[PDB]
């Protein structure tokens, strides 16, 4: 199952100035780019068109091409309706659908960072917790059935006829396996007489990876997973362990990943390899983090 996300960010500075940029993610792979400077939607993968013909695509691109202008020009009128709301304003649209032959499509809209409006059923909707000054704007937008129609088309039927196309298209790219590379280091802990043992993992795909510090068969419970970090399209992760200075020895960073095939990267703290590498990377230590 893969969540297909259409992300649009629109910034209005004042009466005159406004810009809109958009990105498209399948799973966690960028497939489409659209710049306020650019006139046509850019492909970012050699399969981002999906199982759609040029005619099917040009018509859809045109559909959004008209939308971009229309959207900008609508908002700045909605502002004119409201002394109520003031510039500068930040519009964030989050469309898409998750594929399970079952799908759940969604269209969420966020105002100034807070999510306030969504599309539901056959119209736009305010949420629970939303402010009441967003009501008249909704009543104005729900008057247009013609738009409300064309949205439902894309949500109810078009997205999955498209997404199921992409999955089938980029099967080889989405299934690509990458070997993680790993190394160790240490930093003085925020505590007295302690040491944090960084273990680095870099360059793997897909995302799900397993890292644990070990004393043989024993999993070290103070192992702290980092947050995944992006690199191209690969993944970076680090797993820390706080140790009482003098316990460094006998430990090991173990990395399990689908691309290894039951043959894990195992890094022993204080092995000839660790000694040799940690030397290859010495430095003056200014400016280190406080």
């Amino acid at each position: 199952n893969y969540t297909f996300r259409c992300l649009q960010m629109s910034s209005f500075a004042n009466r005159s100035w406004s810009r809109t940029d958009s990105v498209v993610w399948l799973g966690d792979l960028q497939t489409h780019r659209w710049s306020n400077d650019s006139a046509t939607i850019s492909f970012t993968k050699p399969w981002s068109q999906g199982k759609l013909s040029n005619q099917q695509w040009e018509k859809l691109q045109h559909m959004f091409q008209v939308y971009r202008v229309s959207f900008t020009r609508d908002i700045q009128e909605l502002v004119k309706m409201m002394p109520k709301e003031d510039y500068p304003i930040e519009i964030q649209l989050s469309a898409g659908c998750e594929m399970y032959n079952a799908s759940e499509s969604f269209l969420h809209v966020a105002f100034q960072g807070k999510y306030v409006v969504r599309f539901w059923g056959t119209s736009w909707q305010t949420v629970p917790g939303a402010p009441s000054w967003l009501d008249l704007p909704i009543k104005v937008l729900n008057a247009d059935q013609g738009t409300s129609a064309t949205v439902q088309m894309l949500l109810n039927d078009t997205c999955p006829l498209f997404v199921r196309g992409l999955l089938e298209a980029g099967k080889s790219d989405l299934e690509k396996q990458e070997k993680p590379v790993a190394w160790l280091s240490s930093v003085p802990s925020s505590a007295h007489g302690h040491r944090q043992l960084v273990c680095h993992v870099s360059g793997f795909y897909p995302k799900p990876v397993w890292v644990m510090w070990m004393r043989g068969d024993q999993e070290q419970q103070g192992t702290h997973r980092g947050d995944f970090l992006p690199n191209d399209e690969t993944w970076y992760l680090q797993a820390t362990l706080d140790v009482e200075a003098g316990e460094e020895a006998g430990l090991a960073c173990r990395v399990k990943h689908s691309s290894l095939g039951g043959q894990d990267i195992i890094l022993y703290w204080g092995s000839l390899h660790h000694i040799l590498d940690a030397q290859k990377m010495v430095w003056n230590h200014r400016h280190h983090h406080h």
């Epitope: 008209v66 229309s70 609508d74 009128e77 004119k80 309706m81 104005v140 937008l141 008057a143 247009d144 059935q145 013609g146 738009t147």
Partner: T-cell receptor, first 108, second 112 residues
Framework: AVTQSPRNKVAVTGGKVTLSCNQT?????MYWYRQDTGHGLRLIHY???????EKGDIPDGYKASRPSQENFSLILELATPSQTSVYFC????????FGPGTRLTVLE | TQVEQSPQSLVVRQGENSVLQCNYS??????LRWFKQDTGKGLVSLTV?????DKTSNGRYSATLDKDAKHSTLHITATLLDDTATYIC????????????FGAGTQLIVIP
């Protein structure tokens, strides 16, 4: 129905002309237009509701004002010979309903 | 000009057909109203066309629309004298409370 007063007006260059417009159809959007030969109607000012004014396409020389929902006025601060035309007032909730039109002649 | 009307002036012998044209280059194009202006008076809405390819009738007036060409046409069958007016073609760009687009209109003179 939409009603405009005055219906006809002769004004002097640099004079202060005002064209009041009225409707009791309980609308919210009100528009001012200018008609000149070989042109078609052009928007001058418009209002999304009470206490609101918004510049249209040709707003230079004109000020709009809305004190109530029912009424919408257009002010020519310094009248110009270049502003001799027929002015229309419309309204909507879109189905725009138009008024009888005012003939304003501005002379030197 | 954003919206063009043909001809400038059509002249018909009372009690015959009369076709008036309208071409627009406006996007997006929600609908199209035809108006009727009695010389020295307001505008009166004859008919409206919303669909991609639309056809409609009202009295002797019957109008057509094809958005695949962004084009309109107004037919009046068996013209009366009291039809001598200007007919203006008006395009609506959004189906919500949007700015209308006005053609220069067509003055229709009917000879008896």
């Amino acid at each position: 129905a939409v009603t405009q007063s005055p219906r006809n007006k002769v004004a002097v260059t640099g004079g202060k002309v005002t064209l009041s417009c009225n409707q009791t159809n309980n609308h919210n959007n009100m528009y001012w237009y200018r008609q000149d030969t070989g042109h078609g109607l052009r928007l001058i000012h418009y209002s999304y509701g009470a206490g609101s004014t918004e510049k249209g396409d040709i707003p230079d020389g004109y000020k709009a004002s809305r004190p109530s929902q029912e009424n919408f006025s257009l002010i020519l601060e310094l009248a110009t010979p270049s502003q001799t035309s027929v002015y229309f007032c419309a309204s909507g909730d879109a189905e725009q309903f138009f008024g009888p039109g005012t003939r304003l002649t501005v002379l030197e | 000009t954003q919206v063009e009307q043909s001809p400038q002036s059509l002249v018909v012998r009372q009690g015959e057909n009369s076709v008036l044209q309208c071409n627009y280059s406006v996007t997006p194009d929600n609908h199209l109203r035809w108006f009727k202006q009695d010389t020295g008076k307001g505008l009166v809405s004859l008919t409206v066309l919303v669909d991609q390819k639309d056809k409609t009738s009202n009295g002797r007036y019957s109008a057509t629309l094809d958005k695949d060409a962004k084009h309109s046409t107004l037919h009046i069958t068996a013209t009366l004298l009291d039809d001598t007016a200007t007919y203006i073609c008006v395009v609506g760009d959004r189906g919500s409370a949007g700015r209308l687009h006005f053609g220069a209109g067509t003055q229709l003179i009917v000879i008896p």
